[PDB]
Write a protein that binds this DNA or RNA. Structure first.
Ligand SMILES: [Mg+2]
Ligand SMILES: [Mg+2]
Ligand SMILES: [Mg+2]
Length: 89
RNA sequence: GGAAAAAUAAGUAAACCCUACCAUUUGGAACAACAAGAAGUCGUAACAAGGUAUCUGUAGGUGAACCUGCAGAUGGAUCAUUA
C-alpha cells in the first residue's frame, strides 16, 4: 500500500562542476508546468520536465537548490516534510 | 467761568479665533526601495563575422543576459566589377 507520496530530490553532475536538481515524486495533482515556471524565477535557473517511464514526471532544473525545494514543497504543503528525500552526496 | 470721575460716536488698532494660502525648517516604519562589491547562483548577451554582426526607434514576449517583427545607420566582418 504505497499510496503515500515519496519525493526524491536528485543531484547530478551534468558538466565539470555544473549541477542538476531533479525532483521526482510529485503527484500529478498539480501540473509541474506551473511549478516549472515558479521555480525558474524562484531560484533563477533553467528547468525542464523530463518524463521517463510514461507515467513518472520529473522536474530537472540546473543548480542545487534541494535545500530550497524541500523547504519549498513543505512550506507549501504539496508534500509533507517527512515524505521528502534528499539524495545528496 | 475754568474743571476732575463717568458716559458717547466715528477712528487708529493691540491681542485672540475662524477660513484660505505662502515661505523656511524638521520628521517617519516592518516589508519594500536605492547604493556599492565579489573566483556567490544560472546561463552566456557583447568584443572575435563572439555561431554567420552589432546598434537606434517602436512593438510583443521571456528564469536572466535577451529573442523576435517592421524601418534605419555604419561607427561593419565591402570604400571596388553589365563586358
Ligand atoms: Mg556578477
Ligand atoms: Mg531591437
Ligand atoms: Mg519592452
Amino acid at each position: 500500500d504505497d499510496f503515500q507520496t515519496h519525493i526524491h530530490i536528485r543531484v547530478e553532475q551534468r558538466r565539470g562542476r555544473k549541477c542538476f536538481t531533479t525532483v521526482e515524486g510529485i503527484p500529478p495533482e498539480f501540473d509541474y508546468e506551473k511549478i516549472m515556471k515558479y521555480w525558474k524565477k524562484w531560484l533563477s535557473c533553467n528547468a525542464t520536465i523530463v518524463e521517463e517511464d510514461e507515467g513518472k514526471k520529473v522536474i530537472k532544473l540546473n543548480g542545487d537548490h534541494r535545500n530550497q525545494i524541500q523547504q519549498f514543497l513543505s512550506e507549501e504543503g504539496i508534500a509533507a516534510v517527512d515524505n521528502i528525500t534528499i539524495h545528496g552526496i
